[PDB]
Amino acid sequence: ASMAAAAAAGAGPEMVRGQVFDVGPRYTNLSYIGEGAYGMVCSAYDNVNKVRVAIKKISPFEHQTYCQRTLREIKILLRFRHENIIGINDIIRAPTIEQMKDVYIVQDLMETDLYKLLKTQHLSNDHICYFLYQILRGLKYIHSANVLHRDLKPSNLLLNTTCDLKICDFGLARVADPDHDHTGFLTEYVATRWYRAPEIMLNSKGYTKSIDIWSVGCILAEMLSNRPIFPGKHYLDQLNHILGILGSPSQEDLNCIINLKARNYLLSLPHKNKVPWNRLFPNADSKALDLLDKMLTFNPHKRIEVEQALAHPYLEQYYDPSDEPIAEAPFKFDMELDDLPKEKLKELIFEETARFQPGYRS
């Protein structure tokens, strides 16, 4: 019948900023948190466990790319398990695929995020250091499963009252099995502009995991000055912003560009001189600035890998390889085969959420 109507018998559908949340009798007392193009996250009260949770309503079935991203986030998160990464505790959707217009994702509730924190507070070095370590600890696990986040930014860094950090919004994430070649196969417009690596623009569809390391450095820079490091208006201005600090690329740097048209654009650019970090960031710990420089390296292949970053001096107090785990089974090439129509993707989403359905009985 109608679960909402059955819920309505006690307490049922609730309205939040023009969006109805049919999260059933179990979840009530929803409060708006944030929203995206096709989704909205709310805090809510789990009446069964008598605790508050976060609920993400997803409405992707109209568009094929939304469906692709929804299935990727659900499949990656359901198999991921890590301290510094958000997980899926429950999934809510209609019993029949015909009625499935929205999909509800229930996650651990986090009080705030790094983006919110930096607007109101300046972080002490020990806070920056600990936050940065946690970011990389989750990132090590992510890259260990052959997964690229592709949207690391302050807003995607959840924070609770006990200085615990988790990474969320894996909708832009994707599998890239290392054995296969992905040059020219990867989605072109990825990451947020200010945290977008140079090679994403310069080598469209030919980037690697190193784009995440670049984002971390931007976040680290943002923590250090409570201000974005590369506030580009558009991709041209963004490229100018990147080269404003790093300076004109080296010839070795120029040789890693495989887009010849792009390389010639760089050659056509006026010479700009590299800016030292200490002048830009006077009060920053040099140990941090040594690592900051190393994750902002123009060359992606020579960019500091996630394991190497953890072992950098600046995190030596928190560095412990025996408690920086990896996934038991990384993701293979078969998991990236989602170049499908949305009607098929909708079926795949429906199958993947079947375990959460009431009385599944495996």
Binding site: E188, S204, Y235, L236, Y265
Partner: peptide, 11 residues
């Protein structure tokens, strides 16, 4: 590469 054309489009 629809959005990253390095031959500059006319302003």
């Amino acid at each position: 590469p629809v959005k990253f054309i390095f031959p500059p489009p006319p302003l």
